[PDB]
Design a protein around this ligand. Sequence first.
Ligand SMILES: Nc1ncnc2c1ncn2[C@@H]1O[C@H](COP(=O)(O)OP(=O)(O)NP(=O)(O)O)[C@@H](O)[C@H]1O
Ligand SMILES: [Zn+2]
Length: 617
Amino acid sequence: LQLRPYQMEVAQPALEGKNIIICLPTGCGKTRVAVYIAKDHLDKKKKASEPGKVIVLVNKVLLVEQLFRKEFQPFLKKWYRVIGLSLKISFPEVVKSCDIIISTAQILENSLLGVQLSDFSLIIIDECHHTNKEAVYNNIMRHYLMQKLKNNRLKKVIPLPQILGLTASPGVGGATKQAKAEEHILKLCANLDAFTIKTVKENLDQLKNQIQEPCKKFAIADPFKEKLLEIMTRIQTYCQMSPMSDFGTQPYEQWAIQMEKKAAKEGNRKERVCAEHLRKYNEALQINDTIRMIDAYTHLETFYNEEKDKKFLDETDRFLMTLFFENNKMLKRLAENPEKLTKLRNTIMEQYTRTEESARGIIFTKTRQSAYALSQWITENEKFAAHHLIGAGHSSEFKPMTQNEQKEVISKFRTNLLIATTVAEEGLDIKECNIVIRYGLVTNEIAMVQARGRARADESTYVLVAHSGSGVIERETVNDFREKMMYKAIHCVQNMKPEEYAHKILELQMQSIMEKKMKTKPSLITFLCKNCSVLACSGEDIHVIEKMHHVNMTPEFKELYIVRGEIICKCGQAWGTMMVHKLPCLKIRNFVVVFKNNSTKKQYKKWVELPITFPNL
RNA sequence: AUCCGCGGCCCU
RNA sequence: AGGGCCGCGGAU
Ligand SMILES: Nc1ncnc2c1ncn2[C@@H]1O[C@H](COP(=O)(O)OP(=O)(O)NP(=O)(O)O)[C@@H](O)[C@H]1O
Ligand SMILES: [Zn+2]
């Protein structure tokens, strides 16, 4: 099944032709409306004796299972055949059978380079706002439009699907003006070839009483540090390095990176190694502002404890280790004794007293370490009388959670966990949510709306914990203004005259199509260790397996490293990782490449960037 | 146990 | 260009 009255008006144009976008406020239940267009569609095709299909593209693999089980499957189980997919089955073959297909976005893209658009009848799109020139989803929409222009020439026919997009909500990317904001929304319609945004107007009251917004709240605040800065300054005079920017902040952090890069090139030890150590100290200062002082210390302890094993000694590491390990006892002492220290502690407790048990809670924080550090802060410090969730991608030297392990935490939340701490935001379902605090996190107007929509119902409160300065609050205000600005922008395009709207939308389409004219895409090098200048591998000695893993099997290389699997230099600088098949792989980042033609040392972040091709194995 | 490639969003 | 964060795909 059944559609609520407000959801009927938004679905009416989609029901007959008229490819549209559907944007309804968060918590509206708008994935359900998509199911109704599908039923309407397929049933209509059987009567017309024409084929039926639906591709239902999504941004998350976890949404594939979630959408299937909750929305599309249970209603359509008897009538039509539904399949979710992200297990070693051929894609053109699933398309043969199975009236409805819920797939990860890229999975289709892969097969458009076989299966074509012409086969599919209707396309359903989760979070349309990702649609842009830059990314999935998608390039696929430009394939649809490119095919469409082909039809414009024929008239002067190949069948094209109906496109039903679903987003809350398009938003204005990075544009303060009211004029430019509209330009983004015309672009979003242009890429989706949708006729109108089709918001909810006639039934607006029905909704407002059904789904309520959280009241935005505000919390603000305004020894270890001076101890630590003292250490860094002495390290600075050791190398005769003057940054000119204050310690414990980003512009200074970026200067320390750039200094290490150039130091690898000139091959001067003490200049680079210190800078790497400085990056580590600076990290402690910047986290100490936003996180418990024990974590500031722990970040440095584990760093140094790992440096003893890597090493097992030159004058530099001795100056640094001796300097830290004498002060090690001191810092741990300062860490465990209680501005920044007290932050938000009251905030959750106020929510626990009001309602019987604060059954739901959600925190948002910038960094992965902060999620784990806060959770550990909340597990301790009972009586109250909490768990963390983080992403799957691999960077920063933290370990991603398993996708199933994430699925575990939400299912445990549906019950053992009262409060979760995440940077993931949109696309995962939580109900009965109230507090939803954002801790030091800015993001953009679209992430704000998705996150805000977490907590409903009822009486929900949306809180921002901020530093006095540099404030997040100034960036948050502008986000809100833009949230409000998108609505007026979504208004302009609906009441724009059809003759104008269609004429201009084409110029956005032909422009996006004409755009891609571009091209998509060996003994000349010698690799040196970056910490220390020693020949590691000449360029012949590297090999490639399956076009991906860059490996050195040359027995000479075996001599140069130690293990523990992780590969490390004589010096102790990490070199690579040991992958086992029945092959050692090395990260480019740990080496500095010397060009032969004239000696120039360039350093690379990843393998693809360097022009030379390597021999396959 | 990771690798590899691609892409978004932030901030300087 | 950096760092942080998020995600998809192809590997073993
Ligand atoms: N038309 C409907 N009639 C009855 N229940 C509905 C309807 N639509 C959604 N629901 C319920 O709402 C739940 C899912 O919708 P909801 O959690 O509010 O987010 P949603 O479908 O993701 N909307 P959105 O976040 O804006 O994409 C389901 O458990 C349904 O029980
Ligand atoms: Zn070395």
